[PDB]
Amino acid sequence: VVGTFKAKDLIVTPATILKEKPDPNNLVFGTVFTDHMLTVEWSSEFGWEKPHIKPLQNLSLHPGSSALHYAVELFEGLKAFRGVDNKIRLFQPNLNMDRMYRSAVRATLPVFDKEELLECIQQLVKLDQEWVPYSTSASLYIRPTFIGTEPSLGVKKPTKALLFVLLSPVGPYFSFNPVSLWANPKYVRAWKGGTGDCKMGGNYGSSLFAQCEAVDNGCQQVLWLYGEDHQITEVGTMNLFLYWINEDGEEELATPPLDGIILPGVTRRCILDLAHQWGEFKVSERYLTMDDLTTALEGNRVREMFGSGTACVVCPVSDILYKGETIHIPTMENGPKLASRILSKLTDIQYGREERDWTIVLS
Amino acid sequence: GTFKAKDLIVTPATILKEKPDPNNLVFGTVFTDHMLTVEWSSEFGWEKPHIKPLQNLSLHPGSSALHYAVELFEGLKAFRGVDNKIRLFQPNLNMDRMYRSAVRATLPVFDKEELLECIQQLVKLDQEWVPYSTSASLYIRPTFIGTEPSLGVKKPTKALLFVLLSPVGPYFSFNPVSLWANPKYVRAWKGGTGDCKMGGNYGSSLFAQCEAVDNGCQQVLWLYGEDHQITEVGTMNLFLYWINEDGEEELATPPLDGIILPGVTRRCILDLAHQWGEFKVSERYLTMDDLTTALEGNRVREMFGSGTACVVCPVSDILYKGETIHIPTMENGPKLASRILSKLTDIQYGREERDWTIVLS
Ligand SMILES: Cc1ccccc1Oc1cc(-n2c(=O)cc(S(=O)(=O)c3ccccc3)[nH]c2=O)c(F)cc1C#N
Ligand SMILES: Cc1ccccc1Oc1cc(-n2c(=O)cc(S(=O)(=O)c3ccccc3)[nH]c2=O)c(F)cc1C#N
Ligand SMILES: *Cc1c(COP(=O)(O)O)cnc(C)c1O
Ligand SMILES: *Cc1c(COP(=O)(O)O)cnc(C)c1O
Ligand SMILES: [Mg+2]
């Protein structure tokens, strides 16, 4: 009956005892949580309950919950930034609401009003705003999560769900400290006709084995390969950019196209928009193979390779382990000039050093 | 290391729930009085196993089962025999598959015989839930989740293994199924986890299943590749009983090349077909074009799905490219489907002795 929850209906239960904030420079990504969380219950019978901001607490879930059996779940990732003017800003948060709604439809989780969820998120951040670090290299990570909670082993559209939001203060990185990539084509992240273009939990559970194999070989991320010609698709959890002289001898920033096996990153979209705006080199959404890359390296045609994502912004790549060899990528010996310029521009926008359509000041 | 059944801590319920009518059972909606839980940490390993009253789980909202689908499950049944002895059916094959699923999920390994003994003790305590009916059974749902309170993408350092029991009727609610065949959706890929019972394989498949039901179909016919290989009957393995291209009587099923879940029911059916030695048994690729060419030549006898929940699930129709393609399964007996169902149910309910059953602990 209640088609969507409304921020105007928020019930706020503040915590009695507030926790000590961590040192911004000693932060391990996603291990520290703020005082409060957002929860909103849904049922097929009654629709959306009123949204709650309350102290961070365990979830009480029926052990038959479809999130635990059939990965009926999705998540988002976005950040709050304390500006040089001390105003807290979100970055492109409507793109995260759009993507979460699209993910929910694909997961068969109940739809919600995107503007009402964003307002509830703003009110949660506002309450916990002293967690948004006083540092131009740290931020508050925002993790909207949406799970099936129906107490039934049936394989079907859930009749019960929980939408919740966690906040986690994070440093500039995770622990330019460049990443080594593990490339093993025996493992495939995502396929045409699959859900790799949605942020659904199921995409990541199936990717964990390759990630643990990467870390066992001293690599931080998996280079995700696709098809008989070994297309390079994603830098682990991040979109893939290659800055090089292409086959026609033109300076080019290249990234794989949104053909269904690529997560359409907010950071990816912003980087393409900046590169188009600058007009200093060719910008191509195009297929890239291991053979394209190794042929280019042998011709000294590669300048830079980096991943893009909310957590890293720009993540330079120095090495790829492939067929038993270490292939060096000369990113850090080429500046990295473009990676640095992109990171400078995005952080200038995020921390309010310049005005942008891409940021909103916290309500 | 492993938890040990000899260490079981049993907390019996003081208030029992009313048992349901065996003839009114909706699959997986009714749960018994007790559950099994076992905690693991990287720091200290496996804690002692607990049998205690069914309860909600208390999970940190950062638990990797909720964000990154760090989870797997199993499905097997307990049967009250015609002699009133409760039997499990091929449960060691479920333990083998659950162990393999755990390794692929990066969840901690455990001793398969210790888990089976703990499952036997749980069923024994809740044995009056095993229905008094030769067409009902007790569904057993071992489940294994990552519970580490961290958004890190990494091997979990905290996990919970639990087992739920659910009495179930005949079927879900021979009532043959109609299949929805749309090649725009792909269940599983080579280099993926489709050959393991990991939660992630199923969350991504729900959209197609809801589209199937909207078109009056009970299951999705999972198609793969440019040639539209027929792979799985929704949640079930796919069998085709036909005259093949060489004019030989043949039972065909897709091979285990990485996109097929290796079913216990599938294994039992191949074992029986090989034992009978009355026709060719082939693990081979089957395409929509193979099927339609065969139907036009009146070469198809039967198509059925196999799984713990259905045993043998006859297929009457496939909706494909806007046509209903009739499969003549129910006009051909279905003789093989019936023979298989008769044999497996005879073994499950102790109407004949078999190496495939264990009488309860
Ligand atoms: C109500 C009804 C009437 C007639 C035929 C089917 C019916 O319901 C369905 C049940 C299932 N279904 C489950 O609900 C659970 C399992 S399971 O728990 O045994 C299992 C889960 C995951 C993988 C393998 C088995 N396996 C299943 O097939 C399904 F997938 C689709 C439908 C539909 N429509
Ligand atoms: C410890 C360390 C040292 C140096 C570089 C990275 C390091 O940590 C890692 C972080 C991540 N990692 C996360 O843990 C979470 C997200 S996330 O929450 O932003 C995210 C998760 C899922 C999809 C998209 C983003 N994104 C990530 O890359 C990872 F996958 C692998 C490693 C490794 N090794
Ligand atoms: C989340 C994600 C990205 C990057 O998305 P952003 O919106 O830039 O944070 C890239 N690839 C994969 C696989 C992802 O899950
Ligand atoms: C579980 C499962 C089967 C059949 O497994 P059984 O062990 O026979 O119950 C078939 N296909 C898929 C996709 C499955 O998940
Ligand atoms: Mg509105």
Short mmCIF file of N, CA and C and ligand atoms in Angstrom, two decimals, chain A residues 29 75 141 143 173-175 179 199 204 211 215 219-221 237-238 311, chain B residues 68 151-153, ligand 2:
data_model
loop_
_atom_site.label_atom_id
_atom_site.label_comp_id
_atom_site.label_asym_id
_atom_site.label_seq_id
_atom_site.Cartn_x
_atom_site.Cartn_y
_atom_site.Cartn_z
N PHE A 29 40.17 1.11 5.22
CA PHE A 29 38.90 1.24 4.46
C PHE A 29 37.85 0.25 4.97
N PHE A 75 24.16 -3.07 -3.56
CA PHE A 75 24.77 -1.99 -2.76
C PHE A 75 25.17 -0.84 -3.67
N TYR A 141 32.79 7.54 3.52
CA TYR A 141 32.21 6.55 2.59
C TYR A 141 30.78 6.23 3.03
N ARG A 143 27.52 3.73 2.26
CA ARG A 143 27.22 2.38 1.74
C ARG A 143 25.73 2.10 1.90
N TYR A 173 43.59 6.36 0.28
CA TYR A 173 43.78 5.09 -0.46
C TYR A 173 42.89 4.01 0.18
N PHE A 174 43.48 2.93 0.70
CA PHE A 174 42.76 1.77 1.29
C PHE A 174 43.39 1.40 2.64
N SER A 175 44.72 1.27 2.70
CA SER A 175 45.49 0.88 3.91
C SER A 175 45.63 2.08 4.85
N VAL A 179 49.36 -0.09 -8.12
CA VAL A 179 48.86 -1.48 -7.93
C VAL A 179 49.49 -2.41 -8.97
N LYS A 199 25.33 -3.29 -9.62
CA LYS A 199 26.11 -3.44 -8.37
C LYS A 199 25.37 -4.44 -7.47
N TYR A 204 30.17 -10.23 -6.92
CA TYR A 204 31.41 -10.08 -6.12
C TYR A 204 31.73 -11.39 -5.38
N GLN A 211 40.46 -12.94 -6.51
CA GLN A 211 41.02 -11.86 -5.66
C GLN A 211 41.97 -12.47 -4.62
N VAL A 215 46.10 -11.77 -4.24
CA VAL A 215 46.80 -11.37 -2.98
C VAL A 215 47.88 -12.41 -2.65
N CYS A 219 49.60 -9.33 -5.57
CA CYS A 219 48.81 -8.36 -6.38
C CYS A 219 47.64 -7.84 -5.54
N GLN A 220 47.24 -6.59 -5.77
CA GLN A 220 46.18 -5.92 -4.99
C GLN A 220 44.82 -6.12 -5.68
N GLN A 221 44.81 -6.28 -7.00
CA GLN A 221 43.56 -6.35 -7.79
C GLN A 221 43.70 -7.40 -8.89
N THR A 237 37.95 -3.95 -8.87
CA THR A 237 36.71 -3.29 -8.40
C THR A 237 36.52 -1.95 -9.13
N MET A 238 37.36 -1.66 -10.12
CA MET A 238 37.47 -0.32 -10.73
C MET A 238 37.40 -0.42 -12.25
N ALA A 311 36.33 4.72 -4.34
CA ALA A 311 37.26 4.46 -3.23
C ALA A 311 38.67 4.97 -3.57
N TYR B 68 28.50 -8.73 -0.60
CA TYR B 68 29.29 -9.39 -1.68
C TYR B 68 28.89 -10.87 -1.81
N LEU B 151 33.70 -3.79 5.08
CA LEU B 151 33.31 -3.63 3.65
C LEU B 151 34.46 -4.03 2.73
N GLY B 152 35.57 -4.51 3.30
CA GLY B 152 36.71 -4.97 2.50
C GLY B 152 36.28 -6.10 1.59
N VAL B 153 36.76 -6.09 0.35
CA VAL B 153 36.58 -7.21 -0.62
C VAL B 153 37.74 -8.17 -0.37
C1 LIG C 2 45.12 -3.60 1.56
C2 LIG C 2 45.36 -2.90 0.21
C3 LIG C 2 46.63 -2.43 -0.10
C4 LIG C 2 46.85 -1.79 -1.32
C5 LIG C 2 45.81 -1.62 -2.22
C6 LIG C 2 44.53 -2.08 -1.92
C7 LIG C 2 44.32 -2.72 -0.70
O1 LIG C 2 43.10 -3.18 -0.37
C8 LIG C 2 42.21 -3.72 -1.26
C9 LIG C 2 40.96 -3.10 -1.34
C10 LIG C 2 39.98 -3.60 -2.17
N1 LIG C 2 38.74 -2.96 -2.22
C11 LIG C 2 37.88 -3.04 -1.13
O2 LIG C 2 38.24 -3.69 -0.14
C12 LIG C 2 36.65 -2.41 -1.17
C13 LIG C 2 36.31 -1.67 -2.31
S1 LIG C 2 34.79 -0.90 -2.41
O3 LIG C 2 34.04 -1.07 -1.14
O4 LIG C 2 34.98 0.55 -2.79
C14 LIG C 2 34.00 -1.74 -3.69
C15 LIG C 2 33.58 -3.05 -3.48
C16 LIG C 2 32.97 -3.76 -4.50
C17 LIG C 2 32.79 -3.15 -5.75
C18 LIG C 2 33.23 -1.85 -5.97
C19 LIG C 2 33.85 -1.14 -4.94
N2 LIG C 2 37.17 -1.58 -3.40
C20 LIG C 2 38.39 -2.23 -3.37
O5 LIG C 2 39.16 -2.18 -4.32
C21 LIG C 2 40.22 -4.73 -2.94
F1 LIG C 2 39.25 -5.21 -3.73
C22 LIG C 2 41.46 -5.36 -2.87
C23 LIG C 2 42.46 -4.86 -2.03
C24 LIG C 2 43.72 -5.53 -1.98
N3 LIG C 2 44.71 -6.08 -1.96
#
